[PDB]
Design an enzyme around this catalytic site. Structure first.
Site, short mmCIF file in Angstrom:
data_model
loop_
_atom_site.label_atom_id
_atom_site.label_comp_id
_atom_site.label_asym_id
_atom_site.label_seq_id
_atom_site.Cartn_x
_atom_site.Cartn_y
_atom_site.Cartn_z
CB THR E 1 -0.93 0.07 1.24
OG1 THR E 1 -1.97 -0.91 1.13
CG2 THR E 1 -1.56 1.44 1.34
CB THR E 2 2.12 3.84 -1.76
OG1 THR E 2 3.09 2.79 -1.73
CG2 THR E 2 2.82 5.15 -1.49
CB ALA E 180 3.14 -4.45 -0.94
#
Lengths: 222, 214, 214, 214, 222, 214, 223, 214, 226
Positions: E1-2, E180
């Site tokens: 996740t970002t 991710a």
């Protein structure tokens, strides 16, 4: 840390060093470890700083609290019991590393024989207490060295003055053999603190008198 | 409930008026407490804190409760903050709140009247303070003296006539004992807040010492 | 329970009518509080928060309780949210609710009347707000002034007559002291919410300062 | 206990009859709230949920308590289940139960009358719902309008006469303000539950906009 | 996740990717991580899904709850404090692995200078908060790449449009270097989500505009 | 309020009046307790602590409760502090507080009257102390003797007449018994606080031991 | 982190760096670690960020809370006690790694001698406190370096100005030897923050003056 | 409340006076219990502990509660200390405390009268002890016999007349049954505390055996 | 630590040493471990100091508490039970290392035969108790040595005097073989303490009498006796 106490004819004396360490590092040079807790008692505490200050402060409050409520001070036995109970209250924390042990010195005004009305009481971490019968006691990282010193010097104690000298010399010997105990600092002018208690009550010993004693001891060993 | 408050106020008023009298007077050395008290061990005058004293008139068990409560309050505050942070004003304030609550919520009002006094800290200049707290929590500060218990009128006047600011201990004592008459060592309880003391200003004057003063 | 409520209202009203008077006036520099108060150390005017002040008439132990309660409420809200989120309206609202509860549930109603006031934050333009909370929890906001305690009619009339919006501190004070007469430094308690202050707007005006103004 | 209930009912009825009036009207837009309200900051109309509104007459501290309680209830339910699961019927039903309990068990009944209103969700067709909850927990749903506080008869008659289903906002406002007369921006509190709002239907109409509508 | 956020003249923008993973396995392609929490704030949350959704949902409820009780919205400082307190409340659970960290973007309507009324606030697991002063911030497994990218691109931000572009490109760079974090999916037509906040208020950025940005970035690097 | 307290006060007083009598007398060897008591095993005189004794008149179950409470208090204090810290004044104080609470809050007041006595510790010189606690918590310490239960007037007068300070055990018994008459081993309970004992001063005199004194 | 405090004639000064790290990574460059907590006190805190901010904020609230309730400020001893008690309250959490230690600087308006009314107080994790008697103190990852620097420079302190200089230089030395303490950033224009307290109360030192000091120190060591 | 306790005492007295009678007598063998009891299975005489017995008159459910409570107390004490530490005096004392609490605090007083008896341990010489506890907690020890329930006067007089110390079991039984008349196996409940038993002294005398002693 | 107790005709005697250690270090030379707990009982306690003092002090209070409340003393069985219960209450702490075990000596005034009314009771950490039937018992780090000594010497017990001598000698033997138990200190003049209990009650044995016994034992084993 080293704290010593000894009985002399007519009273008792208690003295403590000024050092604090964080591991090997010297973290303090002027710590005061000996507190007058009422008119006739003093407490010296070795161990965790935070716990030591709490003990002395709360204990003095508790003593005077009783006196104000009941109109009369606790008997000496009662003063002992209250300190012991307070120490026991800290057992859980002490087992987690917040350990502090008090040494109690007092003059029992209700004692039959005023010559030997001086009292020294030691305490263990579980609230165990012992009224010392051999004339002196010590607590802290240098307490063994101080007691081995007093063992040899105690015969010289005949009055408050000599008692004070023996106490300061025992502290000196403790500092000499234990790096966690501080000796007299002549450069900064910082010395051990002391309280004397006799029939006229507990009084702080002037720094100047302790400095003089320290200088004599030093000159004597040079 | 208007009647109920009226009755409570009457019960307390009637109770204190039946009790022995007490006076507190500002004097040259501090505050002087003098109470009619036959008892030798039961006390109506007491230390609260370093510079703060307490006197009460009325039902003993009730004002003794309040005495102990005050000491508890003071010692707790001093420990949580610092000794110097405990004041007579603070204690008077807490008694007012306590008696107010007791007066309106207890099964019976407390039949008591209390005086809280404070003198200067050693080496300071500060007029003594006298607070009077009555059974309903009403509070008043007095400049010169406080009278409580029994028939106060004659005592107050006898005092308003002879009271001199900054009198000596001996003069203050006679003024007080006389005002009270409107009494030997055996029937008096005496104590002072002695501003000349280093820390604990409260000291009792009893036996031979008290005799030489009468 | 219609009779009981009537008696509770009667008791509180009488107590307040028997107390000393207080006024709060909006002015060019903020809000001015002036109370008849002989006491040196007992206070009926107080800071609550940065821009919020408090004044009360009636039984001291009771309005002092509410004072402390408000300060507790304000400091808690400010800490849980932010200082700027605490408002006079909020405090007035909570007093209304508190006194309402006290009036119906407590053993005896509180004989008090409260004023909560708020001034603009530093460098803002905002009319001062005055709220008046009575013993039963009734609440009202006033545009110009509030009168509490004792016989309010003559005082309110005097104000209604002489009150000028945006008067100077000195003019406001005179108007207020006069309205109150319907008193020197020794019998007055004075303070302002000074909108010109960066954060804490509350400041007392005492002794020489107050003497000079009078 | 027949009399006690009679007295509580009487006390509440009197308090409400003594208060300022409020009306709520269904209209093409959705529900409209108009209350006699001099205050700048104290409110008797409020947003309870996304499509739900609240209006009250009577003792402010008491209906404000209920207002907060309802917002607490609504937000909790919405979180516990889903926003769409919170309904006007639900809140009205909870108010009935709450006021019922208050009326029989509190020391004093609440002198309040509540209206809960709900409009359709965005893009749905659903008649607005109005519920009226009185001081004893009695509840009624009304098709077209609700009148609360003060002397309702003349106001309700005026509405019964001039009320038109699906009226425009300006017409509804005029009808309402007129019925109320039986005032200006400075003495009115106005708000509407707006159906043509995607989520929050509640919006106040104040100052210049209200004047324009008038 | 970002999740990224950056200030541009007159407002702030926040954008987040769409991926979830269970170890190496891609477990989701359309996760929405950026929520409008009131008229002038948005929250993006990285970490445990269950915790993240709770935060966003409960926080938005809390904000409006205050507004409806008190008649006025919390100050921005207040909004920060409430979010921080909520995060701290989860500390125990976070230490058991249920860890989620919010990033807060907002427009302070009470600010003096509307050009710089945009706000970005980051939070740690113990409820610590920091009002960002350097113009951008990022949280999640790709936040380091996202910030090293913005470090180079931020000078190009002069309005909402360029701000949005830089945010999307930072996300792109994060997905490029962190498995991710998900990049634009042109086959499925799934893109990062974004919110823009200004004086007018917080609004969702249309997918179509983000898609266009993504394509430009992709073409530019081909 | 005021009436209810009077009735509780009347109920208790009558009950105390109806009970058998008890006297406590200071004497050369300590304090002497003598009570009218037919019972072989039910006791109204008892040890509390080392130097402290207890005697009661009134309803047995009630003063026995207080006896047990006192012993509990004393033993607890002694253990928490030191034995020497437990005093007769301290116990009297706690009975005053306890009975005061009982009198205002219990369903029925305790119909009891208590005496707490203390003698000097072994080898000390200290006047014995006699305390009397009544049903409402009122407390008083007597110098020479205490009379409780039944019709006390004749008994107190007889003592006021024949009482000699520092009488022998035998002489004190005669004075006590006689005063009580205004009574053989079988109808008397006798005990002393014997100051000559090393620690536990309390000792009962019964049978042959009692016989020598009579 | 490094926070320093020292007494000069008439007052006390406290300064702190601006850096935060997450392991080796620099996570912040503008952290403010020195807070004015009332008119005559300032608190600098090293350790867990969340805990530090709580301390400073809550403490300042508590101080003013007492003042408003009681009409008078706490005595300095009282201020010390309250801070100590607050730290003690965090002991459990501190043992779980949420450790933060305050350094307290103040001016005691009730002190006899105004020249030496400056106060510096240090605290340990169990709530232990010590009123410093040697003129200066420091807390944080660079505190050793800062104290060893002050040991040599303290003799130059004769007024607020020189006191401030020494404080900034001690911070400089801390940053020089400890990567977790930040030095003056001339490129970004970020400097340590400082508070000075004397009889006129606690005031924030203007960035410009600290920047000037930093530049002088830097030029001096370039040589 | 003078009348309150007055009424409670009347209710209990009447209930007991309306119940069937019971006697307990001391004989050479031990202690003999004889009660008027028609019931086959409902008992008013019972074992409490090794050497201790129980008999009651009045309302069955109420004295059965006390019976069970006593057994609970006795068994609990013997286990915490030792069997030999449980005494009839200890049990009587606890019943006194219990009824006293019941009499003043229960919604209705217990309409019961209790007898607790104790005989010597095997091979010891000790006069039997009889204790009578009444409904208000009053307690008395009797030397020779106890009468409870119904009209006791004639029964007590008959005993006072015919009672001989140390009578045989048969003679005691006859004396008792006769005193009671002022009776056959089917209307009597009989049991003894037989001091000649090694541990459990309580034994019932029923059916043929009881017939044999008649 | 070693504490011994033995029955002689007409009574019981209990004696304890004076030493405390912290590991190898001697931390005390005058500890008193034998307490008179009421007119007819004494308690000796080995183990954690803090726990030992609590036991003795609290137990004595409890015994007299019961006597004042009930007007009569607990039976001997009751006294045993209360001590056992107190010990059991400390089990949790004991498992954490705060372990102390009492030895109870008493004279049962209610016993049929006054010659054998002496009582010795031992206790385990869970509150288990045993009334000793073999004439003697011991507890502490030296208790094995003391009991093996008494095993040989007990036949010499015919009165209080010989009972006391055997008890002191058993302590002597314990100190001789256990470094944690202190022997008579002739230089300082510190000796074991003892209590004797018979029909006239429990009394502390004078130090002078114990010193005399110690000297005789010492002279006897030197051969200075010969």
């Amino acid at each position: 840390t080293t704290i010593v106490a000894l009985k002399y004819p007519g009273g008792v004396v208690m003295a403590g060093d000024r050092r604090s360490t964080q591991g090997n590092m010297i973290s303090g040079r002027d710590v005061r470890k000996v507190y007058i807790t009422d008119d006739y008692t003093a407490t010296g505490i070795a161990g965790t700083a935070a716990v030591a200050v709490e003990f002395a402060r709360l204990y003095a409050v508790e003593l005077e609290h009783y006196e104000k409520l009941e109109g009369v001070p606790l008997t000496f036995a009662g003063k002992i019991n209250r300190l012991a109970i307070m120490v026991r209250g800290n057992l859980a924390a002490a087992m987690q590393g917040l350990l502090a042990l008090p040494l109690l010195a007092g003059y029992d005004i209700h004692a039959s024989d005023p010559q030997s009305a001086g009292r020294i009481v030691s305490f263990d971490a579980a609230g165990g207490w012992n009224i010392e019968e051999e004339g002196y006691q010590a607590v802290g990282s240098g307490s063994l060295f101080a007691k081995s010193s007093m063992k040899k010097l105690y015969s010289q104690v005949t009055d408050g003055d000599s008692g004070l000298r023996v106490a300061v010399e025992a502290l000196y010997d403790a500092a000499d053999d234990d790096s966690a105990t501080g000796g007299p600092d002549l450069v900064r002018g910082i010395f051990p603190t002391a309280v004397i208690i006799d029939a006229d009550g507990a009084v702080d010993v002037p720094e100047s008198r302790i400095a003089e004693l320290a200088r004599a001891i030093i000159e004597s060993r040079s | 409930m208007e009647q109920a408050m009226r009755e409570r106020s009457e019960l307390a008023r009637k109770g204190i008026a039946r009790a022995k009298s007490v006076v507190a007077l500002a004097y040259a050395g501090g505050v002087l407490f003098v109470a009619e008290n036959p008892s030798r061990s039961l006390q109506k005058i007491s230390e609260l804190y370093d510079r703060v004293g307490f006197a009460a008139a009325g039902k003993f068990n009730e004002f003794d409760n309040l005495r102990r409560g005050g000491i508890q309050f003071a010692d707790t505050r001093g420990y949580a903050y610092d000794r110097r942070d405990v004041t007579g004003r603070q204690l008077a304030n807490v008694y007012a709140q306590t008696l107010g609550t007791i007066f309106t919520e207890q099964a019976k009002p407390y039949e008591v009247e209390l005086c809280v006094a404070e003198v200067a800290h050693y080496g300071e200049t500060k007029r003594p303070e006298l607070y009077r707290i009555t059974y309903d929590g009403s509070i008043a500060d007095e400049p010169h003296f406080v009278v409580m218990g029994g028939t106060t009128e004659p005592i107050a006047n006898a005092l308003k006539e002879s009271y001199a600011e900054n009198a000596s201990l001996t003069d203050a004592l006679r003024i007080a004992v006389a005002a009270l008459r409107a009494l030997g060592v055996a029937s008096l309880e005496v104590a002072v807040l002695d501003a000349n003391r280093p820390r604990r200003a409260f000291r009792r004057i009893t036996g031979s010492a008290l005799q030489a003063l009468l």
